[PDB]
Amino acid sequence: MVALKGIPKVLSPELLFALARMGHGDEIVLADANFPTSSICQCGPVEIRADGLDIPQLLEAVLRLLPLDTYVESPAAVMDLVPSDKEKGLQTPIWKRYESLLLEADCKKTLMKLERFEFYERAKKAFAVVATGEMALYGNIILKKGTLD
Amino acid sequence: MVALKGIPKVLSPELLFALARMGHGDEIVLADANFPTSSICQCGPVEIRADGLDIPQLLEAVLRLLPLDTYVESPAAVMDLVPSDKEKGLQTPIWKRYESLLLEADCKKTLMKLERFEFYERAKKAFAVVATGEMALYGNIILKKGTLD
Ligand SMILES: C[C@@H]1O[C@@H](O)[C@@H](O)[C@H](O)[C@@H]1O
Ligand SMILES: C[C@@H]1O[C@@H](O)[C@@H](O)[C@H](O)[C@@H]1O
User: Fold this and answer.
1) Cα distance from B101 to chain A (closest Cα, Å)?
2) Binding positions for substrate (chains A, B)?
């Protein structure tokens, strides 16, 4: 991790580098432990490792530096449950934490829910994919960078 | 240029990456236009280009993020005038700007002035050298990263 004034300690230099290189409209994926990171990163995005971190910690740190797009219906998206899981009535409480962290970063929008394969399509066009140690089911979240001022 | 909350826009992603990778005690050189950056970098330090910027502007931006070493007599050093120049009574006003920027970053120490070849020896062991477009004579400055606790 990095040691610079005003920069969250949990950010690695490679992640900071990725955030700095991203432009307006670019997206970054914070992937859970079960995400097919290896295959997705074969299609374009840079792979960044964050093995010992959970997503809530990382998300909070990223939002301290990353301005979110305010012109899209929602600058943050998660993967919606697959049919089997919806039928089973699966609960995904981690999403409540995401909504809370976004609010604290001044983002009043609600998370967008994308169908599995539609989520995978977006991930392939992402600038980078951060492989975390998040074990929560459906913990993946995609963020879209906006402009400053 | 970088577009991230709280980060000076004049820093390039490569420079930010270097600053994040440096550890306690590591040094970085902000070199003027007449510094032998190419030869010095052949000896170890990474070369980062910032040709369109002068040092005062870059120094201020760097000081906003980089903590300076405290257990050393002085964490900043410039190159002292060679016998020839000190014989012409050559002035070096930019140093006053450096002292001022350092003070504003809460560094009360005075600049350490190193003999030309001593300076080169230090530069060769530096983590990186930033080639700027600074035209001021003897504008080179070395900064030693401290700890953030
Ligand atoms: C069915 C989904 O498959 C991948 O997208 C995982 O990352 C999710 O957490 C979930 O298990
Ligand atoms: C004598 C010195 O030579 C190089 O180190 C230049 O970068 C300095 O500015 C000075 O001219």
Assistant:
1) 16
2) 32, 79, 120, 138, 140
